[PDB]
Symmetry: C2
Subunit: 263 residues, 2 copies
C-alpha cells in the first residue's frame, strides 16, 4: 500500500518514520526543495520526488503542507479517489474537499510533536460518509506515532489543539517553571534541570502505572500542615490550575479564528 506525502516537513517525516518502523507500507514523499528530499532518503531511506506521481483509489495521500500553502499545493492534484489524510491545522474537511476538487474521502488529523519519538497524540475526525474501513486504515497509520483520539464533532479538533497539540509547549513552560524555582533555591543550572526533569518524569510514570485519579494522587501525598500543602495552597491562591484552563481557552479561540481565514 502506497502512502504518499504532499510535503516533507517535520510532521510528515515523523509519520513517515513511524510507518517505516511499522513495516508493510510503500512510502513516497513529494517535496519541492531538494534539501529535505536529500535528508529523508539518507535518514529514512524513503522514496522522494519533487512532485507526486499518478494517484489511484488504492493509494493513501497525506497532506502535510502548511495550511496557507495548501490550496495552491492541491490546485492540480488528481487524487483519483485515493484516501486522503490531512495533518494541517485550520483546514476543515469541507475546505479540504474544495481544494481537492470535490472528493469526500478525507480524514483529518491533529498530531503533536512527541509523535517524532512515537509518543504522539493525534486527534482524528471524518464525516459520517467516510467508511469504517477507511477510518481503520487512517487510524493504523496515525497509531504508528502514538495514541489516536477519534472525535464526533469537527469543532473538537480545536479542543485537541488546545490540549495535546499546543500541550507540549505548556509542559516545557512548566518544566522551566520548576527548574527556575530550583535555581532560586540554590541549585546550579545542571542540577535544576535534572531535578525538574526527573520529578516530572517520575510523577508522570506513577500516574501512568497507577492509573489513579490525578487529584487523588496529589491529595494522597499532601498532609495537612505539611510542606506540600503549603506549596499547593500557594498554587491555589494564585489560581494556577485556572490560569492553565484560561490559556487553553485562549489557544482554542485563536485556533478557531485562524480556521476562519480559510473557511
Amino acid at each position: 500500500m502506497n502512502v504518499y506525502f504532499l510535503g516533507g516537513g517535520n510532521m510528515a517525516a515523523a509519520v513517515a518514520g513511524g510507518l517505516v518502523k511499522q513495516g508493510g507500507y510503500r512510502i513516497y514523499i513529494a517535496n519541492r526543495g531538494a534539501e529535505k528530499r536529500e535528508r529523508l532518503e539518507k535518514e529514512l531511506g524513503v522514496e522522494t520526488s519533487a512532485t507526486l506521481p499518478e494517484l489511484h483509489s488504492d493509494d493513501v495521500l497525506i497532506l502535510a503542507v502548511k495550511p496557507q500553502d495548501m490550496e495552491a499545493a492541491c490546485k492540480n492534484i488528481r487524487t483519483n479517489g485515493a484516501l486522503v489524510l490531512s495533518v494541517a491545522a485550520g483546514l476543515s474537511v469541507g475546505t479540504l474537499s474544495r481544494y481537492l476538487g470535490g472528493t469526500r474521502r478525507i480524514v483529518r488529523v491533529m498530531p503533536n510533536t512527541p509523535g517524532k519519538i512515537g509518543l504522539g497524540v493525534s486527534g482524528m475526525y471524518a464525516e459520517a460518509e467516510v467508511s469504517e474501513t477507511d477510518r481503520r486504515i487512517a487510524d493504523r497509520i496515525m497509531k504508528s506515532v502514538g495514541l489516536t483520539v477519534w472525535l464526533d464533532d469537527e469543532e473538537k479538533m480545536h479542543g485537541i489543539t488546545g490540549i495535546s497539540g499546543s500541550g507540549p509547549a505548556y509542559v516545557f513552560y512548566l518544566l522551566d517553571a520548576l527548574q527556575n524555582a530550583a535555581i532560586r533555591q540554590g541549585f546550579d543550572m545542571a542540577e535544576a534541570r535534572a531535578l525538574s526533569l526527573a520529578t516530572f518524569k517520575g510523577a508522570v510514570a506513577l500516574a501512568e502505572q497507577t492509573g489513579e485519579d490525578f487529584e487523588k494522587l496529589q491529595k494522597n501525598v499532601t498532609s495537612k500542615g505539611g510542606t506540600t500543602h503549603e506549596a499547593v495552597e500557594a498554587f491555589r491562591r494564585h489560581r494556577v490550575a485556572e490560569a492553565i484552563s484560561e490559556g487553553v481557552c485562549a489557544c482554542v479561540r485563536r485556533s478557531q479564528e485562524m480556521e476562519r481565514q480559510y473557511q
Copy 2:
C-alpha cells in the same frame, strides 16, 4: 552486606525492593506491627522481625521511621559503628547523631515517591567527616531507586524537598489542571485523563531525549500570533511560573519550620 531497616513503611519498602533488584545485599527489616512484616515477606521475600538484631560496624542501618517517632525508636539502639542512612524529613545529622548516642557515621537522604518504581530522586548529605567510601556505599544503595544528588550544605535538603520531594504533588496538580481544561473543552473524563497524561509523558520524553533547554523547547514550538502563543501569554499574564516558585518557597519555609521542632 547487611542492610537493616528501622521501620518497614512505604519508603523503606521502596528502597528494600530497589536493593533486591540490584542484588548482592542481605536485607532485614525491623518493624513492630506484624501486619506489614507479613506483607514485605510475601511480596519482597525479605527477612523481617519486630526488633533489630545486634549491629556491627560492617552493617548498614537505614532509619525510616516517622520523624516525630525517631528519638524514641533510636533510644536504645547500639549501632556499634554501623553506617547509618536516614530517609526521615526534618532531622539533621546533628540531631540524628544525638538520638543515636554520638556516632557521626551518618548520611542523610531525601528520597521521593517515584523511587517506588525506580524513577526516584534522592538528595544526599553527609558531614565532611564521612569518608568517600561510606558516601559511595550510601550512594549505591540510593541509586537502587533512582537518581542521587549530593549537596554541599545540609540546608539545601530543604531545597530538595521543595523541588523533587514535594514535586510529584505539583505534577499531579498540573496533570489535573490540564485534564480539567480538557473537560471544559468538551472531552469526557476518560479522554481528558488520557490526553493530559500522554501530553505530559510525550513532552517530558522529548525534553529528556533532546536534552535541550526547556525554555528553548517551548520557544521553538510557539509562533507569534499562533495558538500556543495565546495560551503561553495567558500563563505569563497570570504569573503561573512565578506562582510555582512561590509555592516552592512556601514549601521550603515550612520544611525549615518543621525541622526547628526537633533542633
